[PDB]
Design a protein around this ligand. Sequence first.
Ligand SMILES: CCc1cc(Cl)c(OC)c(C(=O)NC[C@@H]2CCCN2CC)c1O
Ligand SMILES: OC[C@H]1O[C@H](O[C@H]2[C@H](O)[C@@H](O)[C@H](O)O[C@@H]2CO)[C@H](O)[C@@H](O)[C@@H]1O
Length: 432
Amino acid sequence: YALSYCALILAIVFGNGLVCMAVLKERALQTTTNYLVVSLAVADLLVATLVMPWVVYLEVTGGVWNFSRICCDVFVTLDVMMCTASIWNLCAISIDRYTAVVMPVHYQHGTGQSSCRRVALMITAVWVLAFAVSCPLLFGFNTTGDPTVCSISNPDFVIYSSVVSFYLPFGVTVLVYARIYVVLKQRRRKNIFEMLRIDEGLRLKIYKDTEGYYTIGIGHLLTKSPSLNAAKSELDKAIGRNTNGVITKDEAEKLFNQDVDAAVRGILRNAKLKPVYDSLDAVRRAALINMVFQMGETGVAGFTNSLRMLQQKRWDEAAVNLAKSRWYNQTPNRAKRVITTFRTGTWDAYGVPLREKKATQMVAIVLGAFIVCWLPFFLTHVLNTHCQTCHVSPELYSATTWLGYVNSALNPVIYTTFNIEFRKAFLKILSC
Ligand SMILES: CCc1cc(Cl)c(OC)c(C(=O)NC[C@@H]2CCCN2CC)c1O
Ligand SMILES: OC[C@H]1O[C@H](O[C@H]2[C@H](O)[C@@H](O)[C@H](O)O[C@@H]2CO)[C@H](O)[C@@H](O)[C@@H]1O
C-alpha cells in the first residue's frame, strides 16, 4: 500500500473537488440535498489533506510514529471527526429524502424560499456533533502503551465511538430508509379527498383564513362575521356537540366530505358549470371541484373562455388560458397543480417527482457504499481491542482501513453514474 494511497489521495481531492465546483457554479444544482452533499464532499476533502498524509507516513514505517504525541492526537481526532461527519451528514440526507417522499408537495415549496437558515443549522449540527465526538482524544483519551505507536487503543472510547460514530446514525438511516421503501412501495392512487387535503390542509382549532374569515378543518369557512362566538355557534351546529373551538381528525373529515358533496351539487345546479362537469372525467372533475372549493360556484363560473375550452376538450389551451388569471397571481402554486391536473388528467401534480425518486435512489447507494466500506473496519477494530479468538492479522487490518478510505473517492463516481446534471456540469468544468 505504498503508492496506492497517494493515488487515492489525488482521486479524492479530484472528484470531491469537482463535486464542490459543480454545485457552487451550477444554478440548477443549488438545492438543499446537494448543499448537504457538499459538506459530505468536504468531509472527504479534509480526510485526503489532513489525515491521509499521516496514514501514508505510518505506512512507510512499519507502524512507528516519530512525531509529537500532540501531533498524533490531532491526527487521530481528525480521522474520527471526518468519519463521524460523514455518516451523520449521510443520515441528515436520509431524513431530507424522507421528507421529500412523505411530504412531497410541501418539500418543493419549502426548498424554494429562504431555506438556507435550515441547511445552515443542519450542516452546523452535523459538524459540531462531529467535533464533540472526536475531541476527547485531543484532551488525553488517546492513550497507548508506547509513544511510537499512534492509534486508538482505549477500550472505553472505542465502544463509545463505535455506537455514536456508526451503529446509531446507521440505525437511524436504515429505519428511515425502511420507511422510504414502505411508502414508495405503497403506491395508492389519489382522489378528490387526498387532493384537497394537500391543497387546503387540515386544522383542528378555529383559524382566520387568507381573507380573514373564521375557518376550521379542511378549508371549512364557518362564518364571515368578526365574532368568534358565531364561528363556534356555527361550528357546533355543523358537528352536533359543544366543540368550544376544537374538533377531531375524523369530525374534520366528515365535515369535509359534506363540503365536497355540496360542491358537487352546487355545480350541477349551476347552468354554466354543469355541461363542463358532465364532459369531464373523474380526475379532471376533481380539479373543477377543487376550484369551486377554493372560489365558490359563481367565481369559477366567471372563467367563461376556459370553461368552454375544457368542454371542447382543448386541454393545453385551457391551461395556458387559466394561467393568465388573477387566480394564478393570488395563489400561484395551487393554480399550477390544478392547471396541471386539467392539462394532463393525472395526479402527477401531487405525486413524488421523478427528479426526487432518482435522488432518493442515488443516496441509497451512496449510503450502501459507506456501510460496505466502513462495516468491515468497525467489526475488526472492535474485535482486535476486545479480544478472545483474535483471528485478526495486521494484513487484514490494513485492508479494512484501506477499504474505508476508498469510500471517499467513490461518491463522485456514483454522482456521475446516476445523476445526469452532475455528469453534465463535470464535463463542463473539465472541457475548458
Ligand atoms: C471503533 C471506533 C473508531 C472510530 C473512528 Cl471514526 C476511527 O477513526 C476512523 C477509529 C480509528 O481506529 N481511528 C484511527 C485509525 C488508525 C489510523 C487510521 N484510522 C483508521 C481509519 C476508531 O477506532
Ligand atoms: O369558495 C367556496 C368554499 O368556501 C369555503 O371554503 C373556502 C373559503 O373560500 C376560504 O376559507 C379559503 O379561500 O379556502 C376555502 C376552500 O378553498 C367553504 O367552507 C367551502 O365549503 C366552499 O367550497
